[PDB]
Design a protein that fits this description.
The protein has five helices and no strands. With 156 residues, the chain is an all-alpha fold. Helix content is 47%, strand content 0%. The longest helix has 28 residues. The structure holds potassium ion (3 copies) and zinc ion (3 copies). The site of one zinc ion has 8 residues, from loops. The structure holds one RNA strand of 102 nucleotides. Belongs to the BUD31 (G10) family.
RNA sequence: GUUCGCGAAGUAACCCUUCGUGGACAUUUGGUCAAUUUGAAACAAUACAGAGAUGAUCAGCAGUUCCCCUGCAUAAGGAUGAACCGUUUUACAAAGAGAUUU
C-alpha cells in the first residue's frame, strides 16, 4: 500500500476488523522483499515467486471479502483499491469466466511469450497429464518462471 | 471454479439445498545462460635499464604491419605510440687465347 499523506482519506468503517490480516500480509511482504544473498539462480527466482504469491493472496483476501462474502462495504473496498491494498486489474480477471483463479496478469500476456501463447500454468492439469501419458513421459511442468504458479486453471 | 441443461434427495408444493451427470468458458511458460579452482580480463610487484635522425640536446609529420591502446570521434593523444635497422648468388650469355684429353 501507498504511504499515508494529506492525499489519503480516513479508512472507512470496517477497516479495523480486517487490518490485522492485512498487517500480516504486509509483514510477510516486508520480509520477502529483503536481500537474502541467494547464490543460485533458481533460488533467486523462487524468492520473487514468494512476493507474487503474497500479492495474489492479499488481493484474493480482499476480493473474497467484497465479492464473495459481502463482508465489507463498497466504500471500504474502493478505499482498499485506491490505497493499493488490492490489485484491481487482477481482481478484474478473477471476475471473468475461466480466470477465476488466475495467478497473475503476466501469465496471460500472450504478446510477451515466444510463441504468442499464454503461460503453461493456465493449461488444465488433466490436459498436460493426458498429453504426457500419450507421449510416454511424465509431466515435466512444475512451476512457471514468472511466478511459482503450479497451475491456475479454474478447474484446478 | 463459474455458468447453462438434465437425474435425484430434502419440502405439502415452489423458492432454496445437497449428491450425481452432460455442455460452455480458460489451453503449453522458460534457457545461446547451472552455483568457487580446470576454457581463460588486466594492472601491479622485484630487478635491471633510461627515448629516432647526434659530436650533443631535441620539435616533429608520415608510410608499411596478420601490434595496437586512450578517446564520442573521420579530432587529438599514446617515446616522431610501437615494430622497421637483419639476411642477401643463377632469365647468366657472347667473343677469344694459352694450357689439359682421344
Ligand atoms: K633519457
Ligand atoms: K620526438
Ligand atoms: K605524435
Ligand atoms: Zn498461473
Ligand atoms: Zn503467474
Ligand atoms: Zn504461469
Amino acid at each position: 500500500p501507498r504511504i499515508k499523506t494529506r492525499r489519503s482519506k480516513p479508512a472507512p468503517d470496517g477497516f479495523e476488523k480486517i487490518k490485522p490480516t492485512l498487517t500480516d500480509f504486509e509483514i510477510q511482504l516486508r520480509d520477502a522483499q529483503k536481500d537474502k544473498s541467494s547464490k543460485l539462480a533458481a533460488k533467486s527466482n523462487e524468492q520473487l515467486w514468494e512476493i507474487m504469491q503474497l500479492h495474489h493472496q492479499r488481493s484474493r483476501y480482499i476480493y473474497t471479502l467484497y465479492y464473495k462474502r459481502k463482508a465489507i462495504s463498497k466504500d471500504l473496498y474502493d478505499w482498499l483499491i485506491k490505497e493499493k491494498y488490492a490489485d484491481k486489474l487482477l481482481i478484474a480477471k478473477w471476475r471473468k469466466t475461466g480466470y477465476e483463479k488466475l495467478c497473475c496478469l503476466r501469465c496471460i500476456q500472450k504478446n510477451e511469450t515466444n510463441n504468442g501463447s499464454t503461460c503453461i500454468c493456465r493449461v488444465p492439469r488433466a490436459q498436460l497429464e493426458e498429453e504426457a501419458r500419450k507421449k510416454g513421459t511424465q509431466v515435466s511442468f512444475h512451476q512457471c518462471v514468472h511466478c511459482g504458479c503450479r497451475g491456475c486453471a479454474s478447474t484446478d
